[PDB]
């Protein structure tokens, strides 16, 4: 179950990585005068970090040794040119978050780690909601952005 | 101009670095059953991150380009043996945080960037308070750790 | 001295800005942009309040104030769409930031610590103000690309 | 059009009176009459609200407004006691009354019944204003016959 | 640097000194039956002392060694013979209080001590208000004392 | 002289106020924030007593000449909280002696109003000496085990 301790560490790292990527997206939104979209990303940034803290807290309680990895620089921001690009990368991030949680659940299942499985249950359910929501926002952005100016309306 | 813009950008990295080292301390304290000290380190971790977000927000408004950098793996944790070690690393962290702010203020000064200097003032004053507070806690920790079990007795209280 | 002269000029620049905001509110009102008009009117009162704050401080610090003419606004003659108005307003705020920086430079030269402390919150407020007008202008320029679309968001 | 011209001259007069009242507050403040300074300051704000009321009316009624320069108040350079200040203020109010009566006369000639209705409460207000200033000026010139006594009454 | 540290110490002494000078002014007013003026001075004395305490507390946080000096006796009371003399000495005390702070800021500036500069900003602004308020009371006093007994109205009011 | 001693009681109160302030400074610089807050509160209170004496002297036409308030000097030689508390006990004993000498001079002059004014200060000095005495005893007891006194500064 090195594989398990490992994946559990990778999950913590994925949560903080995703928090930074959300922060990068709020920065791009802000810089380009989409304050509504920026507020939304900033709030998701804080939430991803809360998920990381929740995994750490659980690992401490269960004596899963956690060691903090570097949180890499978000990369996609240098390539974003419009809100559509940003929301697409955020959907890909969320798909990565889902995979990372499934990888861990798979390893827990193999080890018969029932406590880890019970712990992950609300995060599986949260990811379903998260993916659906981002996917749904991206569809609106992509439909609205077909008329010059109209997406500025969505920005609330 | 280059210097100021780079340093401002780097100040955000230093805020998030400090956030992660606070978090690593919390995990050490937790793993070693110092839950009072862990909760304190945890709250400081949130607070450092809020400072880095205030620098980001100001940079956005002032058109200072921000490029978010890697937040490095905290390293002091592999070598911590006792609460005193962790608090001493936290003191060094705050002293570093103060130095990075004074450097930034030094560049803002050279550049005559009055806005950045105004923005920095409450951070300077906050750093004075933070160093004092951590210095004080370390002195308390080092004094109580002289009698076996006594320091534990304070984690439980305050 | 040079510091007295500039302190006076800042007063004049605040009252000039207050009138330029009023001129913008009139153009928007006459062209049926009531929400943009209400916004300019609000800014006009607030520039005047800054003017009064400088005067109050100068009287306390024995800096003599000579009230200058507030010149007739002249951009309204060229405005023909909301984008032209907002562009003139961003240039007004850039000039406000400049008048304030010149005053700060002279206070710094004379080592006038109390003047510098007084200007700090105005420094920070000018950051917010430039950002905010820049952002509305970017939004206006984007929405204006579809006929009627700007109008529908003046109703907001 | 006499009417349009005069309606514009009325706005300028309101904003001019606002600036003159401000000049008077400065003189009072500089000379440590904080009670009188606060009174002149409140009156400065009210005069500007009147000018805003005429501008708003003018916009609704399609009276084109071009905002003219607000001249530097210059009386301040020769004021040397509160009596001089209050006397200039009375003179300012008598000029406010004349411009309003001039405007009403042109409205009347043009049979402009909407303008006439709009002017009624300003005619009544000017009545109250001249009475009030004339009455303060009588108190000030009576109390100033005893050294220090006027001061004792700036404790408003 | 020694000079900043020394001026910081002298700033504390200047605040306590002004506190005692205000107290001397309330005593003279009270002895001569100007209880309104006496209450004003007494409020100002507690306030100056609060300033000295704020300076002490900042110095402690920032490890600026403080050594309390003697608070010298007020000297001007022996020569006051009317409220005008008192308010005039009080305006002079506040002019010195402002010079004293300006000197300290100049030394902080030379040293690039941005934390000290940030800490002094509200004291620079408070001195502006204090010198204007005292200057205006002095003007009112010297005007009203032109008519025998009239000044005795200022008092039995403010 | 009653008048001379009355004037000197003012100086003693403000002297005590400053020594208490010197003691908060030492505790604060040495990270005893609990003891520092207590000293600071006692500093304010000693100054209030001095103000009460001045106010009574003004009412009773006792001329008040404010004297120099001397520099506290025990701070030079404090190296533990026990030293600081020992100096404060001596300060309060001094405060008590100067009130008794003032009372003695009032008694000799049959100054009944001064004696009546002093009564609550005599009772307050009894409480003060007891409380400081009692703190010094707790401090000297707890300081026999390394770090233990620190643990109770948090109180
Ligand atoms: Fe997550
Ligand atoms: Fe920080
Ligand atoms: Fe402004
Ligand atoms: Fe009017
Ligand atoms: Fe002060
Ligand atoms: Fe006492």
PDB file of N, CA, C and O in Angstrom, chain F residues 53 56 99-100 102-103 106 111-127:
ATOM      1  N   UNK F  53      -5.122  63.818  44.018  1.00  0.00           N
ATOM      2  CA  UNK F  53      -4.413  64.735  44.950  1.00  0.00           C
ATOM      3  C   UNK F  53      -4.348  66.154  44.389  1.00  0.00           C
ATOM      4  O   UNK F  53      -4.638  67.164  45.113  1.00  0.00           O
ATOM      5  N   UNK F  56      -7.851  67.820  44.670  1.00  0.00           N
ATOM      6  CA  UNK F  56      -8.171  68.203  46.052  1.00  0.00           C
ATOM      7  C   UNK F  56      -7.360  69.417  46.437  1.00  0.00           C
ATOM      8  O   UNK F  56      -7.893  70.308  47.058  1.00  0.00           O
ATOM      9  N   UNK F  99       2.263  58.395  52.331  1.00  0.00           N
ATOM     10  CA  UNK F  99       0.888  58.725  52.772  1.00  0.00           C
ATOM     11  C   UNK F  99       0.794  58.813  54.273  1.00  0.00           C
ATOM     12  O   UNK F  99       0.099  59.692  54.788  1.00  0.00           O
ATOM     13  N   UNK F 100       1.463  57.898  54.980  1.00  0.00           N
ATOM     14  CA  UNK F 100       1.437  57.988  56.466  1.00  0.00           C
ATOM     15  C   UNK F 100       2.117  59.292  56.961  1.00  0.00           C
ATOM     16  O   UNK F 100       1.643  59.934  57.937  1.00  0.00           O
ATOM     17  N   UNK F 102       2.348  62.154  55.290  1.00  0.00           N
ATOM     18  CA  UNK F 102       1.378  63.178  54.984  1.00  0.00           C
ATOM     19  C   UNK F 102       0.273  63.180  56.062  1.00  0.00           C
ATOM     20  O   UNK F 102      -0.065  64.243  56.591  1.00  0.00           O
ATOM     21  N   UNK F 103      -0.267  61.995  56.402  1.00  0.00           N
ATOM     22  CA  UNK F 103      -1.351  61.917  57.421  1.00  0.00           C
ATOM     23  C   UNK F 103      -0.858  62.477  58.770  1.00  0.00           C
ATOM     24  O   UNK F 103      -1.599  63.098  59.519  1.00  0.00           O
ATOM     25  N   UNK F 106      -0.850  66.169  58.649  1.00  0.00           N
ATOM     26  CA  UNK F 106      -2.248  66.646  58.747  1.00  0.00           C
ATOM     27  C   UNK F 106      -2.747  66.548  60.205  1.00  0.00           C
ATOM     28  O   UNK F 106      -3.435  67.407  60.700  1.00  0.00           O
ATOM     29  N   UNK F 111      -5.687  69.149  60.584  1.00  0.00           N
ATOM     30  CA  UNK F 111      -6.346  69.356  59.323  1.00  0.00           C
ATOM     31  C   UNK F 111      -7.297  68.162  59.052  1.00  0.00           C
ATOM     32  O   UNK F 111      -6.940  67.188  58.363  1.00  0.00           O
ATOM     33  N   UNK F 112      -8.510  68.272  59.599  1.00  0.00           N
ATOM     34  CA  UNK F 112      -9.542  67.250  59.497  1.00  0.00           C
ATOM     35  C   UNK F 112      -9.950  66.930  58.052  1.00  0.00           C
ATOM     36  O   UNK F 112     -10.200  65.767  57.723  1.00  0.00           O
ATOM     37  N   UNK F 113     -10.036  67.944  57.183  1.00  0.00           N
ATOM     38  CA  UNK F 113     -10.418  67.667  55.800  1.00  0.00           C
ATOM     39  C   UNK F 113      -9.322  66.843  55.104  1.00  0.00           C
ATOM     40  O   UNK F 113      -9.629  65.896  54.410  1.00  0.00           O
ATOM     41  N   UNK F 114      -8.050  67.176  55.311  1.00  0.00           N
ATOM     42  CA  UNK F 114      -6.992  66.379  54.678  1.00  0.00           C
ATOM     43  C   UNK F 114      -7.058  64.948  55.196  1.00  0.00           C
ATOM     44  O   UNK F 114      -7.031  64.000  54.408  1.00  0.00           O
ATOM     45  N   UNK F 115      -7.247  64.785  56.501  1.00  0.00           N
ATOM     46  CA  UNK F 115      -7.323  63.416  57.067  1.00  0.00           C
ATOM     47  C   UNK F 115      -8.447  62.616  56.484  1.00  0.00           C
ATOM     48  O   UNK F 115      -8.281  61.425  56.219  1.00  0.00           O
ATOM     49  N   UNK F 116      -9.611  63.246  56.336  1.00  0.00           N
ATOM     50  CA  UNK F 116     -10.756  62.557  55.752  1.00  0.00           C
ATOM     51  C   UNK F 116     -10.453  62.198  54.272  1.00  0.00           C
ATOM     52  O   UNK F 116     -10.782  61.112  53.786  1.00  0.00           O
ATOM     53  N   UNK F 117      -9.837  63.132  53.533  1.00  0.00           N
ATOM     54  CA  UNK F 117      -9.487  62.863  52.148  1.00  0.00           C
ATOM     55  C   UNK F 117      -8.546  61.636  52.007  1.00  0.00           C
ATOM     56  O   UNK F 117      -8.705  60.780  51.095  1.00  0.00           O
ATOM     57  N   UNK F 118      -7.596  61.535  52.930  1.00  0.00           N
ATOM     58  CA  UNK F 118      -6.624  60.428  52.935  1.00  0.00           C
ATOM     59  C   UNK F 118      -7.225  59.042  53.287  1.00  0.00           C
ATOM     60  O   UNK F 118      -6.714  57.992  52.826  1.00  0.00           O
ATOM     61  N   UNK F 119      -8.304  58.993  54.071  1.00  0.00           N
ATOM     62  CA  UNK F 119      -8.786  57.667  54.512  1.00  0.00           C
ATOM     63  C   UNK F 119      -8.945  56.582  53.409  1.00  0.00           C
ATOM     64  O   UNK F 119      -8.461  55.460  53.590  1.00  0.00           O
ATOM     65  N   UNK F 120      -9.620  56.893  52.273  1.00  0.00           N
ATOM     66  CA  UNK F 120      -9.665  55.795  51.331  1.00  0.00           C
ATOM     67  C   UNK F 120      -8.289  55.433  50.719  1.00  0.00           C
ATOM     68  O   UNK F 120      -8.103  54.272  50.345  1.00  0.00           O
ATOM     69  N   UNK F 121      -7.334  56.368  50.660  1.00  0.00           N
ATOM     70  CA  UNK F 121      -5.986  55.998  50.187  1.00  0.00           C
ATOM     71  C   UNK F 121      -5.257  55.107  51.177  1.00  0.00           C
ATOM     72  O   UNK F 121      -4.578  54.216  50.752  1.00  0.00           O
ATOM     73  N   UNK F 122      -5.412  55.321  52.497  1.00  0.00           N
ATOM     74  CA  UNK F 122      -4.828  54.413  53.435  1.00  0.00           C
ATOM     75  C   UNK F 122      -5.366  52.995  53.250  1.00  0.00           C
ATOM     76  O   UNK F 122      -4.608  52.067  53.352  1.00  0.00           O
ATOM     77  N   UNK F 123      -6.689  52.829  53.099  1.00  0.00           N
ATOM     78  CA  UNK F 123      -7.272  51.495  52.908  1.00  0.00           C
ATOM     79  C   UNK F 123      -6.864  50.921  51.549  1.00  0.00           C
ATOM     80  O   UNK F 123      -6.634  49.742  51.394  1.00  0.00           O
ATOM     81  N   UNK F 124      -6.784  51.754  50.524  1.00  0.00           N
ATOM     82  CA  UNK F 124      -6.338  51.215  49.296  1.00  0.00           C
ATOM     83  C   UNK F 124      -4.869  50.751  49.357  1.00  0.00           C
ATOM     84  O   UNK F 124      -4.518  49.732  48.744  1.00  0.00           O
ATOM     85  N   UNK F 125      -4.021  51.457  50.110  1.00  0.00           N
ATOM     86  CA  UNK F 125      -2.619  51.009  50.255  1.00  0.00           C
ATOM     87  C   UNK F 125      -2.501  49.669  50.944  1.00  0.00           C
ATOM     88  O   UNK F 125      -1.631  48.885  50.618  1.00  0.00           O
ATOM     89  N   UNK F 126      -3.338  49.436  51.947  1.00  0.00           N
ATOM     90  CA  UNK F 126      -3.406  48.101  52.560  1.00  0.00           C
ATOM     91  C   UNK F 126      -3.717  47.053  51.520  1.00  0.00           C
ATOM     92  O   UNK F 126      -2.987  46.057  51.446  1.00  0.00           O
ATOM     93  N   UNK F 127      -4.774  47.244  50.723  1.00  0.00           N
ATOM     94  CA  UNK F 127      -5.069  46.234  49.686  1.00  0.00           C
ATOM     95  C   UNK F 127      -3.907  46.061  48.728  1.00  0.00           C
ATOM     96  O   UNK F 127      -3.565  44.957  48.411  1.00  0.00           O
TER      97      UNK F 127
END
